Amino acid sequence: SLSTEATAKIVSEFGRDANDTGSTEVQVALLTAQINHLQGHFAEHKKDHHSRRGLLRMVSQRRKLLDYLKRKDVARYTQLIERLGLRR
RNA sequence: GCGUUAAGUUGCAGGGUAUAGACCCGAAACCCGGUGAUCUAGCCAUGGGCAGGUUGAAGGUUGGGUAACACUAACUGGAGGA
Ligand SMILES: [K+]
Ligand SMILES: [K+]
Ligand SMILES: [K+]
Ligand SMILES: [K+]
Ligand SMILES: [K+]
Ligand SMILES: [Mg+2]
Ligand SMILES: [Mg+2]
Ligand SMILES: [Mg+2]
Ligand SMILES: [Mg+2]
Ligand SMILES: [Mg+2]
Ligand SMILES: [Mg+2]
Ligand SMILES: [Mg+2]
């Protein structure tokens, strides 16, 4: 759902440089962007169960990445959820 | 068979009959034209009344909760031919 420009913008804002697409912060920010963007799709299409399975995978993938970041560097974790607006 | 050989008629009094309320009193009812919604039934307009004490619906806020909902606890709130 995310376009190329929007994706590239996130990589630059959370990565080390322009092609640090793999860092945990970038991945979590990318997932957060798609999850938030898809809230408008599922408000209109409540019965799109097949797409929602893909969304719930993003949610669980983000939870696992966050639990890993919190276990490695708590400081990086705290900054990340604050910038993104996540409860935990 | 009915008649012919038996005086009627007009007053007055009386007996009966007829039409009339027709010896007197008495229905329940039927019809016609009026008077009544100051009681009461319903409605319409415009005003008033309901001591005191209870119960605690929806909603709201805050926290928990969720990807977001849902959900949940407290506080608040003051529903009802209660
Ligand atoms: K005579
Ligand atoms: K008589
Ligand atoms: K009362
Ligand atoms: K309540
Ligand atoms: K009450
Ligand atoms: Mg993907
Ligand atoms: Mg006479
Ligand atoms: Mg008659
Ligand atoms: Mg009759
Ligand atoms: Mg009258
Ligand atoms: Mg009256
Ligand atoms: Mg009552």
mmCIF file of all heavy atoms in Angstrom, chain A residues 39 55-56 59 87, chain B residues 64-68:
data_model
loop_
_atom_site.group_PDB
_atom_site.id
_atom_site.type_symbol
_atom_site.label_atom_id
_atom_site.label_comp_id
_atom_site.label_asym_id
_atom_site.label_seq_id
_atom_site.Cartn_x
_atom_site.Cartn_y
_atom_site.Cartn_z
ATOM 1 N N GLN A 39 -5.933 1.403 8.145
ATOM 2 C CA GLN A 39 -7.093 1.614 9.002
ATOM 3 C C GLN A 39 -8.241 2.232 8.223
ATOM 4 O O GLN A 39 -9.407 1.943 8.504
ATOM 5 C CB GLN A 39 -6.726 2.489 10.197
ATOM 6 C CG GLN A 39 -5.747 1.844 11.153
ATOM 7 C CD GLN A 39 -6.272 0.554 11.754
ATOM 8 O OE1 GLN A 39 -7.400 0.492 12.237
ATOM 9 N NE2 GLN A 39 -5.457 -0.489 11.711
ATOM 10 N N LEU A 55 -2.881 -7.790 7.223
ATOM 11 C CA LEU A 55 -2.679 -6.733 8.207
ATOM 12 C C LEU A 55 -2.281 -7.300 9.563
ATOM 13 O O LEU A 55 -1.385 -6.770 10.222
ATOM 14 C CB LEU A 55 -3.941 -5.889 8.339
ATOM 15 C CG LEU A 55 -3.983 -5.006 9.579
ATOM 16 C CD1 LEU A 55 -3.022 -3.862 9.404
ATOM 17 C CD2 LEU A 55 -5.373 -4.485 9.827
ATOM 18 N N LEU A 56 -2.935 -8.375 10.001
ATOM 19 C CA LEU A 56 -2.621 -8.936 11.308
ATOM 20 C C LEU A 56 -1.225 -9.534 11.338
ATOM 21 O O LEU A 56 -0.606 -9.607 12.401
ATOM 22 C CB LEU A 56 -3.658 -9.983 11.691
ATOM 23 C CG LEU A 56 -5.045 -9.398 11.927
ATOM 24 C CD1 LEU A 56 -6.095 -10.491 11.914
ATOM 25 C CD2 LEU A 56 -5.072 -8.646 13.230
ATOM 26 N N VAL A 59 0.979 -6.650 12.172
ATOM 27 C CA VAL A 59 0.900 -6.342 13.594
ATOM 28 C C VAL A 59 1.769 -7.295 14.403
ATOM 29 O O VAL A 59 2.498 -6.874 15.305
ATOM 30 C CB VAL A 59 -0.563 -6.379 14.064
ATOM 31 C CG1 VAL A 59 -0.630 -6.300 15.568
ATOM 32 C CG2 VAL A 59 -1.340 -5.247 13.433
ATOM 33 N N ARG A 87 1.791 2.450 22.197
ATOM 34 C CA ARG A 87 1.661 2.244 23.634
ATOM 35 C C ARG A 87 2.808 1.402 24.171
ATOM 36 O O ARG A 87 3.367 1.708 25.230
ATOM 37 C CB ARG A 87 0.323 1.582 23.958
ATOM 38 C CG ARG A 87 -0.881 2.288 23.368
ATOM 39 C CD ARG A 87 -2.001 1.310 23.056
ATOM 40 N NE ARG A 87 -2.014 0.184 23.979
ATOM 41 C CZ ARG A 87 -2.228 -1.074 23.624
ATOM 42 N NH1 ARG A 87 -2.444 -1.410 22.364
ATOM 43 N NH2 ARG A 87 -2.217 -2.021 24.556
ATOM 44 P P G B 64 -3.503 3.292 31.594
ATOM 45 O OP1 G B 64 -2.034 3.189 31.746
ATOM 46 O OP2 G B 64 -4.058 3.999 30.416
ATOM 47 O "O5'" G B 64 -4.118 1.824 31.651
ATOM 48 C "C5'" G B 64 -3.783 0.946 32.715
ATOM 49 C "C4'" G B 64 -4.657 -0.284 32.753
ATOM 50 O "O4'" G B 64 -6.051 0.091 32.906
ATOM 51 C "C3'" G B 64 -4.658 -1.168 31.518
ATOM 52 O "O3'" G B 64 -3.520 -2.006 31.421
ATOM 53 C "C2'" G B 64 -5.961 -1.935 31.679
ATOM 54 O "O2'" G B 64 -5.820 -2.954 32.653
ATOM 55 C "C1'" G B 64 -6.872 -0.849 32.247
ATOM 56 N N9 G B 64 -7.605 -0.161 31.173
ATOM 57 C C8 G B 64 -7.425 1.120 30.739
ATOM 58 N N7 G B 64 -8.213 1.430 29.759
ATOM 59 C C5 G B 64 -8.951 0.285 29.530
ATOM 60 C C6 G B 64 -9.965 0.026 28.588
ATOM 61 O O6 G B 64 -10.428 0.781 27.737
ATOM 62 N N1 G B 64 -10.441 -1.267 28.692
ATOM 63 C C2 G B 64 -10.000 -2.187 29.597
ATOM 64 N N2 G B 64 -10.584 -3.387 29.550
ATOM 65 N N3 G B 64 -9.058 -1.959 30.484
ATOM 66 C C4 G B 64 -8.585 -0.708 30.393
ATOM 67 P P G B 65 -2.809 -2.245 29.999
ATOM 68 O OP1 G B 65 -1.766 -3.280 30.180
ATOM 69 O OP2 G B 65 -2.441 -0.927 29.436
ATOM 70 O "O5'" G B 65 -3.959 -2.844 29.076
ATOM 71 C "C5'" G B 65 -4.486 -4.141 29.296
ATOM 72 C "C4'" G B 65 -5.619 -4.440 28.348
ATOM 73 O "O4'" G B 65 -6.704 -3.503 28.559
ATOM 74 C "C3'" G B 65 -5.304 -4.302 26.870
ATOM 75 O "O3'" G B 65 -4.621 -5.426 26.353
ATOM 76 C "C2'" G B 65 -6.680 -4.091 26.260
ATOM 77 O "O2'" G B 65 -7.371 -5.325 26.157
ATOM 78 C "C1'" G B 65 -7.361 -3.247 27.337
ATOM 79 N N9 G B 65 -7.275 -1.805 27.050
ATOM 80 C C8 G B 65 -6.428 -0.897 27.621
ATOM 81 N N7 G B 65 -6.587 0.307 27.158
ATOM 82 C C5 G B 65 -7.606 0.184 26.232
ATOM 83 C C6 G B 65 -8.217 1.154 25.412
ATOM 84 O O6 G B 65 -7.976 2.359 25.334
ATOM 85 N N1 G B 65 -9.205 0.603 24.620
ATOM 86 C C2 G B 65 -9.561 -0.714 24.616
ATOM 87 N N2 G B 65 -10.543 -1.046 23.775
ATOM 88 N N3 G B 65 -9.004 -1.632 25.378
ATOM 89 C C4 G B 65 -8.039 -1.114 26.154
ATOM 90 P P U B 66 -3.448 -5.239 25.275
ATOM 91 O OP1 U B 66 -2.738 -6.530 25.197
ATOM 92 O OP2 U B 66 -2.682 -4.014 25.580
ATOM 93 O "O5'" U B 66 -4.220 -5.010 23.905
ATOM 94 C "C5'" U B 66 -5.098 -6.005 23.407
ATOM 95 C "C4'" U B 66 -5.900 -5.509 22.235
ATOM 96 O "O4'" U B 66 -6.861 -4.515 22.669
ATOM 97 C "C3'" U B 66 -5.122 -4.808 21.139
ATOM 98 O "O3'" U B 66 -4.462 -5.711 20.272
ATOM 99 C "C2'" U B 66 -6.199 -3.983 20.449
ATOM 100 O "O2'" U B 66 -6.953 -4.783 19.555
ATOM 101 C "C1'" U B 66 -7.091 -3.591 21.629
ATOM 102 N N1 U B 66 -6.782 -2.233 22.117
ATOM 103 C C2 U B 66 -7.346 -1.177 21.445
ATOM 104 O O2 U B 66 -8.082 -1.324 20.494
ATOM 105 N N3 U B 66 -7.020 0.054 21.925
ATOM 106 C C4 U B 66 -6.200 0.327 22.985
ATOM 107 O O4 U B 66 -6.004 1.493 23.299
ATOM 108 C C5 U B 66 -5.654 -0.817 23.633
ATOM 109 C C6 U B 66 -5.955 -2.031 23.184
ATOM 110 P P A B 67 -2.935 -5.462 19.858
ATOM 111 O OP1 A B 67 -2.479 -6.655 19.113
ATOM 112 O OP2 A B 67 -2.191 -5.013 21.053
ATOM 113 O "O5'" A B 67 -3.022 -4.251 18.834
ATOM 114 C "C5'" A B 67 -1.872 -3.529 18.425
ATOM 115 C "C4'" A B 67 -2.205 -2.628 17.266
ATOM 116 O "O4'" A B 67 -2.446 -3.438 16.096
ATOM 117 C "C3'" A B 67 -3.472 -1.807 17.433
ATOM 118 O "O3'" A B 67 -3.223 -0.590 18.105
ATOM 119 C "C2'" A B 67 -3.956 -1.611 16.003
ATOM 120 O "O2'" A B 67 -3.276 -0.527 15.391
ATOM 121 C "C1'" A B 67 -3.498 -2.901 15.335
ATOM 122 N N9 A B 67 -4.552 -3.923 15.227
ATOM 123 C C8 A B 67 -4.613 -5.110 15.903
ATOM 124 N N7 A B 67 -5.642 -5.843 15.582
ATOM 125 C C5 A B 67 -6.292 -5.092 14.623
ATOM 126 C C6 A B 67 -7.456 -5.321 13.886
ATOM 127 N N6 A B 67 -8.204 -6.415 14.009
ATOM 128 N N1 A B 67 -7.840 -4.374 13.012
ATOM 129 C C2 A B 67 -7.090 -3.277 12.893
ATOM 130 N N3 A B 67 -5.975 -2.949 13.530
ATOM 131 C C4 A B 67 -5.628 -3.912 14.391
ATOM 132 P P A B 68 -4.134 -0.140 19.341
ATOM 133 O OP1 A B 68 -3.495 1.043 19.954
ATOM 134 O OP2 A B 68 -4.392 -1.321 20.186
ATOM 135 O "O5'" A B 68 -5.493 0.315 18.657
ATOM 136 C "C5'" A B 68 -5.522 1.413 17.760
ATOM 137 C "C4'" A B 68 -6.720 1.350 16.852
ATOM 138 O "O4'" A B 68 -6.666 0.143 16.055
ATOM 139 C "C3'" A B 68 -8.071 1.277 17.540
ATOM 140 O "O3'" A B 68 -8.537 2.541 17.974
ATOM 141 C "C2'" A B 68 -8.951 0.626 16.483
ATOM 142 O "O2'" A B 68 -9.363 1.575 15.515
ATOM 143 C "C1'" A B 68 -7.970 -0.343 15.825
ATOM 144 N N9 A B 68 -8.069 -1.703 16.383
ATOM 145 C C8 A B 68 -7.321 -2.265 17.378
ATOM 146 N N7 A B 68 -7.653 -3.499 17.642
ATOM 147 C C5 A B 68 -8.682 -3.768 16.764
ATOM 148 C C6 A B 68 -9.465 -4.907 16.546
ATOM 149 N N6 A B 68 -9.327 -6.043 17.220
ATOM 150 N N1 A B 68 -10.412 -4.844 15.593
ATOM 151 C C2 A B 68 -10.553 -3.703 14.913
ATOM 152 N N3 A B 68 -9.875 -2.570 15.029
ATOM 153 C C4 A B 68 -8.948 -2.669 15.985
#
